[model samples]
Target chain A: SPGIWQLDCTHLEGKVILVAVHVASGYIEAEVIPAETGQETAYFLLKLAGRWPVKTVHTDNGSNFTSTTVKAACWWAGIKQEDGIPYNPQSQGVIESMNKELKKIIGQVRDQAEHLKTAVQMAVFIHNHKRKGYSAGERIVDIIATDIQ
Target chain B: SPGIWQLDCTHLEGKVILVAVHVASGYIEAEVIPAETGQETAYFLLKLAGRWPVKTVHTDNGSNFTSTTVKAACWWAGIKQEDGIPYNPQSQGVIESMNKELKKIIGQVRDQAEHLKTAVQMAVFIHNHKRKGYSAGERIVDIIATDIQ
Candidate 1:
């Protein structure tokens, strides 16, 4: 079954990093933006949905994630959007942990893609590669195959 | 596309009315209960799922609706659950209006289903019938048929 797309946003190096992780496979996708807006988030979501079999999107009770634009975008893309409980970061523990990890690594790995959009992607690449035997990309492909059958 | 299942709860005449309205067709399903809890709400939701093609359920940020119990229930039922923006009734305007309408008619038509569970059903029946030429039930059937082929 297709699981959740856990999403969260954080600021690092004067840029907003919007991150999405497939809950089932731990495959991560990140993008660096100058700022955050619901419209831009929706566009990112559509692109992600095209690449993955996204059943539902889980995020904290952030205004941009809950905005009308994002809601309508999910409706158009045939994805269901869910929010964590109010005042409860535990409800979105997966993405919260990811954000913390990203902040730590991005600060430490200032040598790679430090001055470019490539930094977040490099951070995600290292994170994905550390998932033991199977690469995150391989796991994602396996999941898609399983869903197809 | 299948629209939203708008849900809300209200109190009237010593009972709790859990109401769900189909956002696209204005079809409504309501239940009168002795009390409210996340477990009980989930049970009612499964029954409603059996009767309708529910893609997503939209509700206010009430604890019962946003409880982990309800969230797990939705996951099990293959339904996505969405909450209105915190402190914003406008986010759930559809179900909010239906709740207001139900309270009004239940008060006025006390003679119809007084002292029975049939009271709310009677109210819903009258409301569905008054939806101009096509009954809400018929509209629901048409929607299901359209989705089939």
Candidate 2:
């Protein structure tokens, strides 16, 4: 009953932020922003990173993203920056696919009270841990550890 | 045929710009841009408006159109701005319908030696002048003379 609630921030006044995390490994980060301004987005990213080790960050060339401050922050943090070409989702396929999964999970929980964020978290957890069709039916976490090291 | 072209500048370098114009009265305008940047789009629109008396301009909240320069230009030009919600084309029903008509015309012209732009223009001309519809069963120019200023 308790889960992540996916909020449609298109109409929301403030920044629209969504975070995706590897539930088991605690690998997490946020996407989307309130405005297309760089400094504000950089601050948000810094806050979200907190003490975690961010291996990579990916985004499109939204103005907020192409800002100097955000670029500087990524450089200072030793995080690899990957940019998707404008209007192309293939480069960031992982996040793009995750977004679809998040949407489906959130839609299922929409009628519930304040369960959106929790739903997203659970979806991530399931996606990482559940074994389905590929690689001898191994969990995605295991596959990530073995292949992405 | 010499009118406005609606374009999706989201991936302008590689994508086709959709252009449309009323065949009879030559009521024409367009969406989309070649670049997602606001300044580039503002420049494009200024060029367009200089060439045509655009009565209306329609778009979505693409950063290009929402940029200050583009908005200011439209405001100063006395051209009405109509923005559709992201992912919702219903608000711009007429244009979407026009897009369908454009597509049909493109299909008809597929065998021609002309390029896409020429085909689109020819289609637009025919739709505006020759394609008779139920609206008073008269030429758009005549309708415009009586109804439009």
Candidate 3:
């Protein structure tokens, strides 16, 4: 199955963070830490693959994904890491579309931060079931298969 | 007669933009270019005053307006430039209202770039002569002369 993730960088004092996105379902899982190194990438893969059993994990070739830890994790899980070509962001179309949807929903509720979270959750729910790609003409879940066989 | 000038900032490159708004009439004139220098500010005031014969110009304390050119221009034109306090933009309520009106009108146009010019002109026209403010219960032009004395 194909899954998506959108990584956000935090400049605050706490820790490094990464957000894993289930492209078909709009499920978001977050991980927080001090630094995103190769080892952290591997750990993230192990945790996500173990839980979701996805066949492919799409990611940008940020330092975290290119790290040795992440490579080893992918090898162990038998999950292929589909790194998007450098500078060609359209290759990871799922996350890009999600960002646009997120911005539209979030920008409307900026004044009330608390309500924004609830709004985003509702938006994600609606988007997963209702959003249809022009070419696919079907919901994202219909296109993703749990088993490759 | 009150009118709107449809200015294009696309040719100005990356200059600080300013839109001078006539509060009573909802008339607007916009300028885009490099930040106004002391001389440039004066030149702007002189040019606008000669064309519009404005008595008062309200603006925020942005560096562009605080320049010597602007002060000279205002002095030459016998126009008073009211500078709002730092971070307090409420003093320029008329322009802010105009901006909201412009955004709403622009959003309704199907081909934004192609239709924006026409929509803006129509909006300004309606605002000045047709649209009645709640306080006045009449067109803006009917109440604008009250500010002159």
- Note the DockQ of each predicted structure: 0.01, 0.01, 0.01
True contacts kept of 3: 0.00
Error of 1 at A22 (Å): 42
Ten-residue region with minimum lDDT total, candidate 2 chain A:
A1-10
Candidate 1 lDDT over A29-54, as tens digits, reads 77778888886677667556533456
Each candidate: chain B TM-score? 0.83, 0.56, 0.54
Off by over 4 Å in 1: A1-149, B1-3, B86-93
State the lDDT of candidate 2 residue by residue for B119-149, as single tens digits. Answer: 4443443444343442211333234333322
Where in model 3 is the C-alpha error above 4 Å? Answer: A1-149, B1-17, B31-44, B86-95, B109-123, B133-140, B143-149
lDDT over C-alpha atoms for residue A11 of model 2: 13
Full ranking by lDDT: 1, 3, 2
Docking class of 3: incorrect
Residue pairs clashing, model 3: B38-B68, B38-B69, B41-B69, B41-B70, B42-B69, B42-B70
Interface RMSD score of each model: 19.6, 28.7, 29.7
What is the lDDT for B117 in model 2?
43
lDDT for B146 in candidate 3 is 30
lDDT of 2 by residue, A107-145 (tens): 664453143333343343334333344211122223232
